Design an enzyme around this catalytic site. Structure first.
Site: not given
Ligand code: UDP
Ligand code: UDP
Ligand code: GAL
Ligand code: GAL
Ligand code: MN
Ligand code: MN
Lengths: 282, 282
Positions: A240, A263
């Site tokens: 990432e 999330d």
């Protein structure tokens, strides 16, 4: 050769009423940022069907993560590019553990056996290498989409995302100023970004593009990771971090809002999100 | 191969503050609509310079319209793609009347002699044929921009416009509902659009794109005009009617706001326009 659209009846876009006034819908380099209310999916579906577009979806399910595949694929079937041609590429160390999920017409699944690495960091990081594989995707699909497996689709994820190169706004950082971003900050790493640089903090769990641009990105991130290794440094957030360096210097042609990687347990359901489309599984 | 950008220091885009809240900045098929405040020209300039982009600009100056070339070109020099490579293609029946205008470095002008048609309608309409010429643009430029000559640049017109295919919002109709648009309404014309279709009313005086997409568009509009002729019908607004039919069925990948084609005498300076970049000369 882009084929002519047929007649269609739909609401007129009005230039003096924006869709969304609450959020940035275009980046400063003129890339759309994809939010609900910004796209007419009937128009986009026509455009992409007339090209007989094939989308590949890559997912890694190594070691215990094979448990997440049933829900991931079942819900992909309900929400991901329905009506379009889809090829799922499931990379796993356990081919026999891949669940037998019933697919809609025009959709297929291939199981690609790979080595498991011991450290979850290397499993995550080596996706770039594995994705970059290369002649296969070029012959079989138009676009590649690359996601995390510990996820479920809850709502529409369709051709509105497709473009030469896209990343997704990390759901923890879309409202943050850039010095708060968890970019790699050590100059000794290839992933280094200084405190006064950065557009966005992109999530490593959802990126894609044309096969060409995806191969470029995954090759560049793998090369950069190998350089870091030779130099004894591991970036703070692994693949990432490199993805973020790449997309800083090679701007994406669309950016997905956090609708596309959310999330709910950690972050709830803010009013700015009209839809939660692809969500973390606890 | 898109080359890496260098480090740059610029304001962070903030996803929870839109640039512009007063206007639509993206179409429902995810094409940017180009307004002041939506683009960071320093980023775009980098991206396009790293590709050594060449822009061609076509302009017709037939009969008495040759009088408009001096101002058109002088002001183009001040405002149009400055810093980039530019090739002006001046189509005229009077090569000796083309003014000798001093050009910046990296910019060139060619004079292409053409036949004058008697009727101003045919002069306007035959631009499509003339633009479609064809091998020449393919070898010499990356993008083609096609404008009216009775105009002047007053402010920046740069690489923010470049894309595979663009049209420009007609300044008289950007706030109008679609049934008010002056599309060709007779079913007997190839340019016909029914009252419940249409996204925008594009101006015939400013369109462009990649050389490929521009050749497609000009060829399709010329073919459609020839069909109408064989059938004894002339569309209400000539080339502009066909352009509108084309762009309805082949959506543009950017849309220019009316900043890019304005008439201050007719329409003043509304607050929605932060800049008047290319304007009608009385
Ligand atoms: O043992 C592992 C660790 C990682 N992954 C793959 O790498 C992705 C990234 O890891 P994870 O989802 O754990 O990272 P997070 O979302 O918590 O940052 C996972 O979705 C899997 O697709 C895997 O398959 N097995
Ligand atoms: O006698 C003529 C008529 C038209 N034109 C070209 O065709 C364009 C379209 O015509 P015009 O600008 O008159 O149309 P309008 O903007 O009034 O709709 C002009 O800009 C010129 O570029 C020309 O060169 N000579
Ligand atoms: O700061 C970056 C991190 O943010 C977390 O919320 C996420 O679970 C991590 O995988 C990583 O993306
Ligand atoms: O209704 C369409 C027309 O609008 C006028 O304002 C313009 O001068 C014409 O050339 C044509 O575009
Ligand atoms: Mn994950
Ligand atoms: Mn004109």
């Amino acid at each position: 050769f882009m084929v002519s659209l047929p007649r269609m009846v739909y609401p007129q876009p009005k230039v003096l009423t924006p869709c969304r006034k609450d959020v940035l819908v275009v980046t400063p380099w003129l890339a759309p940022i994809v939010w609900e209310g910004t796209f007419n999916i009937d128009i986009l579906n026509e455009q992409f069907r007339l090209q007989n577009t094939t989308i590949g979806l890559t997912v890694f399910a190594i070691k215990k993560y094979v448990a997440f595949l049933k829900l991931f694929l079942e819900t992909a079937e309900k929400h991901f590019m329905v009506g379009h041609r889809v090829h799922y590429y499931v990379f796993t160390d356990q081919p026999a553990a891949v669940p037998r999920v019933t697919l809609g017409t025009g959709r297929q699944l291939s199981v690609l056996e790979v080595r498991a690495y011991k450290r979850w960091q290397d499993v995550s990081m080596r996706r770039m290498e594995m994705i970059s594989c290369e002649r296969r995707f070029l012959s079989e699909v138009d676009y590649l989409v690359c996601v995390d497996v510990d996820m479920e689709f809850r709502d529409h994820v369709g051709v509105e995302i497709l473009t030469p190169l896209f990343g997704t706004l990390h759901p923890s950082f879309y409202g943050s100023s850039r010095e708060a971003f968890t970019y790699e900050r050590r100059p000794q790493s290839q992933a280094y970004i200084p405190k006064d640089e950065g557009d966005f903090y992109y999530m490593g769990g959802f990126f894609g593009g044309s096969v060409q641009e995806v191969q470029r990105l995954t090759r560049a991130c793998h090369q950069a990771m190998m350089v870091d290794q030779a130099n004894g440094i591991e970036a703070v957030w692994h693949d990432e971090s490199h993805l973020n360096k790449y997309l800083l210097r090679h701007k994406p042609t669309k950016v997905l809002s956090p609708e596309y990687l959310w999330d709910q347990q950690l972050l709830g359901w803010p009013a700015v999100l009209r839809k939660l489309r692809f969500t973390a599984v606890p």
